């Protein structure tokens, strides 16, 4: 009964956005996903690609059918729409901070749906972009989603950052702070 590992193949398709996703997960971490627009496998860590492969064409096949099924189900459910569930945002660092010692801010957006969200990094009111990256939409046993946004930065005594998350389940945009506290 002792469970050790879980490998999940997770995919989804959403309307009217017309956005889909196909990805593999290991014990909670993303092994890889297929960028739908470019139709190509992209590994969560480049090393993984040097030891394994995946035919992106496969993802296309699966999402194609997923899209058809969404059409079917929506109609069958008599067009019942999904109920928005707002995210819980939290922002912390990669490791302890030291002045001028490179670090990384992590914005955790959790327990939400549908998988559509707009995130914005802000340093003293100005949106920051250089260096930022993010993960695709990760799955949850309760079928809501998880997402991570990253911002590499150089700690300083004169900077306050915040992660701004926007979602249909929220009344106003959510804004999480971070100023070394």
């Amino acid at each position: 009964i002792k469970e050790e590992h879980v490998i999940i193949q997770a995919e989804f398709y959403l309307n009217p956005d017309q956005s889909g996703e196909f990805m593999f997960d290991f014990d909670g971490d993303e092994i890889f996903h297929v960028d739908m627009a470019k139709k190509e496998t992209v590994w969560r860590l480049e090393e993984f690609g040097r030891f394994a492969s995946f035919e992106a064409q496969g993802a296309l096949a699966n999402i194609a059918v997923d899209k058809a099924n969404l059409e079917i189900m929506t109609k069958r459910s008599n067009y019942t729409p999904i109920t928005n569930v707002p995210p819980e945002v939290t922002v912390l660092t990669n490791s302890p901070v030291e002045l001028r010692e490179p670090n990384v801010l992590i914005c955790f957006i959790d327990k939400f749906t549908p998988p559509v969200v707009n995130v914005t990094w802000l340093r003293n009111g100005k949106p920051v972009t250089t260096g930022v990256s993010e993960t695709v939409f990760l799955p949850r046993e309760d079928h809501l989603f998880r997402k991570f946004h990253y911002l590499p930065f150089l700690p300083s005594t004169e900077d306050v950052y915040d992660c701004r998350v926007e979602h249909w389940g929220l009344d106003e945009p959510l804004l999480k702070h971070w100023e070394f506290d």
Partner: protein, 190 residues
Amino acid sequence: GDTRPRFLWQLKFECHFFNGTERVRLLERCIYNQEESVRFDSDVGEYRAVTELGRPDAEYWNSQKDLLEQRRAAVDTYCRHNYGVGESFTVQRRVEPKVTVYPSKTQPLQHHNLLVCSVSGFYPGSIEVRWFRNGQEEKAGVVSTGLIQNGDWTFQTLVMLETVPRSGEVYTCQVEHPSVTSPLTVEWRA
């Protein structure tokens, strides 16, 4: 500015492994919006409706002899196979945690209350952090952030000790993890 209603369709194939690949279970599920409708459980061998909306699908798919055979075998052609394809960088991936200790105030109106033991960048998530005050283990005063998954194949966690250090005391943060054969330790002279 988009008030339009949304319709979501999710599909998931879960491979649960026990004791290596000795025991394996495959769980396939269809979720409309936020509710699972149909599922295939390798322990059952055929599709079963979770909600009424899923009955048509179980009924249709189960009548497909060739399909059910594929699923019943998937436990080997899919689960066991992919586990192998990635064992090297997944089941085997090990990343040594970086441990550091620094003080902090429980309140900006208090002295120098608790010591924070920072343990970051490690993998797997399985780990143990203990606090020692002069060789004597401390437990009643420890509070933690709990395990935190960074989403980039690394974890972190902060284990704090509620104790006002007095001159002469030497605290120790001991960390035991699969990436290291002998426990890591960081001391803090009061």
